[PDB]
Every structure is written in C-alpha cells, then in structure tokens.
Amino acid sequence: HMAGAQDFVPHTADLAELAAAAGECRGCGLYRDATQAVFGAGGRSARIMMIGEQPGDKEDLAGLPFVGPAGRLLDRALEAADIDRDALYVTNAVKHFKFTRAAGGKRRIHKTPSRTEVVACRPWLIAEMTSVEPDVVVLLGATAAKALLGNDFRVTQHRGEVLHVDDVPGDPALVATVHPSSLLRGPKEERESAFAGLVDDLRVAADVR
C-alpha cells in the first residue's frame, strides 16, 4: 500500500466510510492547500456514475461535488436528458481542489491535475466504482476520460460512443463527453450546440442496458 492513495483507502465499500477516510488522505500533495476532500455524492444503487476532473472553488467549500455554475449547467443537461437523481453517483477524478490565485480575480483558479495526481487518486475512483457497480460511467472532460481510458485517449474523437475497457472493474459501459465548465465560455450559438451534444451523450449513457 505504498502507492498514492492506496493505503488511505479502507477495505470497505461503504460510501460514508470511504468519504470519511478520504477526508484524511495524503496520497498526493493536493490535500495541503485545499480546504477539504470532496468525495462523490449519491448512493450505491445508482446505475449512472459521472466523473469530473476535480472539485472547483465552490465545491471545495461546499464539501459536495458539482455545485457551481458548471454543476447548474449539468443539472440543465440531465433535465433535458431524462435522467433522474436517484440514478446518479457523481464524483471527480481528483478529490482535492488544485488551484492558484491571480490578483483581482473573482475566484480561485483551477489548475490541471497532473497525470501523477490522477493516478495517485485513482484508488478512490476504483473504490467508488466497486462500491456503486454502475451500469455506465460518464467521463466529463479529458482529465476524467484519461483516468479510465488511457493517457492517450482523446475525448474529441469518440463523442457519443459507448466504450468498454477490460481493466475497469465490473466492465461498465463508458461514455466520454465534454467538460461542462467548458460550456460556460464562448459564443451563445456554440455553447448551445455544445449543450445539445452533452445532452446527446447523457441520453446515450442513460440508455445503456
């Protein structure tokens, strides 16, 4: 248990115990500056798991995943797909906010977790997957997609595709889609196109049998 977060992950599938243990994780350096660990949220009967990159500024203080503008956009997209809450477990590839500030900024600015951090934190993701046994996993953005599909995976090339990789416990369906935060910037028309495609991918996931 010498690698990354491995020794911090208890031998239990209980999400409450997992979240408590993740609160004490020192498996990479990100715990130092962040406020708290942000574990995933939902229950183990969920059939759809969603994985973002990391808790953001709001998530870091809320102690819950997907609470910012990007979570609100995600809510809009789940609505437009016909996805119910009880079906969902939502979490992040890295579970401590990695960040910096810029003078005059209105928020703390997220920084991209390195591959080393993603791999160090992945024992938690594996624990969550084995705990939840989802039918499908939605990977929201490149960091999360690469966490499970390989450092060379390209989200832009596999949109709407149902993927299956044989080193993911329980062989769930996998669907890689856009980083919802990316849909906050830019021309309305392209944000609307992007939103429709995210809904497309969520429907694809929700229809996995």
Judged by CB under 6 A, the chain residues 18 through 77 that form the site for ligand SF4 are 22, 25-28, 30-31, 37
173 Cβ partners below 8 Å, 6+ apart? 135, 136, 137, 162, 163, 164, 205, 208
Q: Figure out which of the listed residues 5, 125, 176, 183 binds ligand SF4, where binding follows CB under 6 A.
A: 5
Contact call for residue 144 and ligand SF4 (CB under 6 A): no
For ligand SF4, the closer CB: 13 or 208: 13
Q: In 97-109, which positions are buried (b, 16+ CB within 10 angstroms) versus exposed (e)?
A: bbbeeeeeeeebe
28 annotated to bind ligand: yes
Strand order of the β-sheet with 173-177 is 41-42, 88-92, 48-52, 136-140, 173-177
- Three-state DSSP at 11 gives coil
Per-residue binding letters, 103-142, with ligand SF4 (x by CB under 6 A): -----------------xx--x------------------
Q: How far is the CB of 174 from ligand SF4 (least distance, A)?
A: 21
Q: How far is the CB of 73 from ligand SF4 (least distance, A)?
A: 24
Stretch that binds ligand SF4, among 75-83, 89-97, 128-136, 167-175 (CB under 6 A): 89-97
CA distance 53 to 146: 10
Please state whether 120 falls in left (phi above 0), alpha (psi between -120 and 50) or beta: alpha
CA distance 132 to 134: 5
> Can you tell me which residue has the tokens 């992950």?
9
For ligand SF4, the closer CB: 97 or 199: 97
Contact call for residue 94 and ligand SF4 (CB under 6 A): yes
Contact call for residue 15 and ligand SF4 (CB under 6 A): no
Nearest to 138 by CA among 74, 94, 80, 79: 74
Annotated binding residues for [4Fe-4S] cluster, written as ranges, equal 25, 28, 96, 121
Question: What residues line the site for ligand SF4 (CB under 6 A)?
Answer: 4-5, 22, 25-28, 30-31, 37, 94-96, 120-121, 124
